Design a protein around this ligand. Structure first.
Ligand code: NAG
Lengths: 42, 49
């Protein structure tokens, strides 16, 4: 099972990660059943 | 195949369904039937398994 959790946040900080807390809601659960060891950003 | 053939020679379409169980999570499941919800009574509930 591939669990994808997501959270969308309105920010106005220029360069880095803002300091705070925001719990990520589950977005989708996919029954893909495949081996994953490497990933790529598009 | 001609329409005027005997019943032992007429074309028959055959579909064979093969069911296997593997270590992966089983996802082809049979339809689940749901009853008319009853409130305000002591009942046996089976919500989402
Ligand atoms: C997944 O892939 C890695 C590297 O190819 C391998 O070491 C590992 O045994 C694999 N796991 C499964 C369950 O196939």
């Amino acid at each position: 099972y591939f669990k994808i959790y997501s959270k969308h946040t309105p920010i106005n900080l220029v360069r880095g990660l803002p300091q705070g807390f925001s719990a990520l809601e589950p977005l989708v659960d996919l029954p893909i059943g495949i081996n994953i060891t490497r990933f790529q950003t598009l | 195949f001609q329409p005027t053939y005997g019943v032992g020679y007429q074309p028959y379409r055959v579909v064979v369904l093969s069911f296997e169980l593997l270590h992966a999570p089983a996802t082809v499941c049979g339809p689940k039937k749901s009853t008319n919800l009853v409130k305000n009574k002591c009942v046996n509930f089976n919500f989402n398994g």
